[PDB]
Design an enzyme around this catalytic site. Structure first.
Site, PDB file in Angstrom:
ATOM      1  CG  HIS A 159      -1.887   1.154   1.216  1.00 26.88           C
ATOM      2  ND1 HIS A 159      -2.775   1.354   0.183  1.00 26.88           N
ATOM      3  CD2 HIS A 159      -2.148   2.121   2.128  1.00 26.88           C
ATOM      4  CE1 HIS A 159      -3.533   2.406   0.451  1.00 26.88           C
ATOM      5  NE2 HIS A 159      -3.180   2.882   1.629  1.00 26.88           N
ATOM      6  CG  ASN A 175      -4.458   5.390   3.981  1.00 23.90           C
ATOM      7  OD1 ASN A 175      -4.042   5.090   2.850  1.00 23.90           O
ATOM      8  ND2 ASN A 175      -5.001   4.504   4.800  1.00 23.90           N
TER       9      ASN A 175
HETATM   10  C1  LIG Z   1      -2.179  -0.231  -3.315  1.00 20.49           C
HETATM   11  C2  LIG Z   1      -3.617   0.204  -2.977  1.00 20.49           C
HETATM   12  O1  LIG Z   1      -4.041  -0.068  -1.836  1.00 20.49           O
HETATM   13  O2  LIG Z   1      -4.232   0.776  -3.886  1.00 20.49           O
HETATM   14  C3  LIG Z   1      -2.142  -0.984  -4.643  1.00 20.49           C
HETATM   15  O3  LIG Z   1      -2.704  -2.260  -4.534  1.00 20.49           O
HETATM   16  C4  LIG Z   1      -0.705  -1.079  -5.140  1.00 20.49           C
HETATM   17  O4  LIG Z   1      -0.312  -0.404  -6.071  1.00 20.49           O
HETATM   18  N1  LIG Z   1       0.091  -1.940  -4.491  1.00 20.49           N
HETATM   19  C5  LIG Z   1       1.460  -2.106  -4.890  1.00 20.49           C
HETATM   20  C6  LIG Z   1       2.356  -2.346  -3.681  1.00 20.49           C
HETATM   21  C7  LIG Z   1       3.115  -1.114  -3.191  1.00 20.49           C
HETATM   22  C8  LIG Z   1       4.465  -1.594  -2.668  1.00 20.49           C
HETATM   23  C9  LIG Z   1       3.284  -0.037  -4.262  1.00 20.49           C
HETATM   24  C10 LIG Z   1       1.527  -3.330  -5.793  1.00 20.49           C
HETATM   25  O5  LIG Z   1       1.120  -4.414  -5.411  1.00 20.49           O
HETATM   26  N2  LIG Z   1       2.043  -3.114  -7.007  1.00 20.49           N
HETATM   27  C11 LIG Z   1       2.146  -4.186  -7.967  1.00 20.49           C
HETATM   28  C12 LIG Z   1       3.534  -4.213  -8.564  1.00 20.49           C
HETATM   29  C13 LIG Z   1       4.434  -5.372  -8.115  1.00 20.49           C
HETATM   30  C14 LIG Z   1       4.388  -6.568  -9.065  1.00 20.49           C
HETATM   31  C15 LIG Z   1       4.136  -5.794  -6.676  1.00 20.49           C
END
Ligand SMILES: *[C@@H](C(=O)O)[C@H](O)C(=O)N[C@@H](CC(C)C)C(=O)NCCC(C)C
EC number: 3.4.22.2
Length: 212
Positions: A159, A175
């Site tokens: 997140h 947030n």
């Molecule tokens: C976060 C949200 O709550 O909207 C969204 O799910 C997100 O972009 N999460 C990323 C994790 C953070 C470390 C930026 C994510 O999972 N991004 C996917 C890219 C990678 C393959 C993990």
């Protein structure tokens, strides 16, 4: 750097947003840092388009998640529009930047904060809002209603949020879950525990825009 930093008091933070069901936290996080750095450099606080990054950052995966650093690179490479011009829709659509006229703002690059280093992150926050990631999947984080948050949480970061301040015993986080969550949309996460990852992995991956 000072003992307390709160970019909201220097008029550099826009109202708290709600990303809705879309996994667009990476775009919301990036935009906070763009809103902050534009106000810091130009004196004007404007809202910029999370939707534009959602639609246009081809390295990220829309509502399935994405990378704050890639969104930040997009704004440095191209620019970003006002939120009013390109409002949030909560769904990835096609990239409409060219239909919406000139960009409202552009940055000059993206820097990474040295990871796993609390002091390096605080130094960055003292300069400008910073995009940071944390583990938000835990029920304790999701049910947070106030106080200095110590967890429990692991370091499985999932997140993107924005650090907009800090104090002796916390980092202040904007947030994107609306004003009903946490402290009117903010969370204070404990710092200074000696955990190199930071509480909830907060020191894993932090980026900020550069604007000359
Ligand atoms: C976060 C949200 O709550 O909207 C969204 O799910 C997100 O972009 N999460 C990323 C994790 C953070 C470390 C930026 C994510 O999972 N991004 C996917 C890219 C990678 C393959 C993990």
């Amino acid at each position: 750097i000072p003992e307390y930093v709160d970019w909201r008091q220097k008029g550099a933070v826009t109202p708290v947003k709600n990303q809705g069901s879309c996994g667009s936290c990476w775009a919301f996080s990036a935009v906070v840092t763009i809103e902050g750095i534009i106000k810091i450099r130009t004196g004007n606080l404007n809202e910029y388009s999370e939707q534009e990054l959602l639609d246009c950052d081809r390295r990220s995966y829309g509502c399935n998640g994405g990378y704050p650093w890639s969104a930040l690179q997009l704004v440095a490479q191209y620019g970003i529009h006002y939120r009013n011009t390109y409002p949030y829709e909560g769904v990835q659509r096609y990239c409409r930047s060219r239909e919406k006229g000139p960009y409202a703002a552009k940055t000059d690059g993206v820097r990474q904060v040295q990871p796993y280093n609390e002091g390096a992150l605080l130094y960055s926050i003292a300069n400008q809002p910073v995009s940071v990631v944390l583990e938000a999947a835990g029920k304790d984080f999701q049910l947070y209603r106030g106080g200095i948050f110590v967890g429990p949480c692991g370091n499985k970061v999932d997140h993107a949020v924005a650090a907009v301040g800090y104090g002796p015993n916390y980092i202040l986080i904007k947030n994107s879950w609306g004003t009903g969550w946490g402290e009117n949309g903010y969370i204070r996460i404990k710092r200074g525990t000696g955990n190199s990852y930071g509480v909830c992995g907060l020191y894993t991956s932090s980026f900020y825009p550069v604007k000359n």
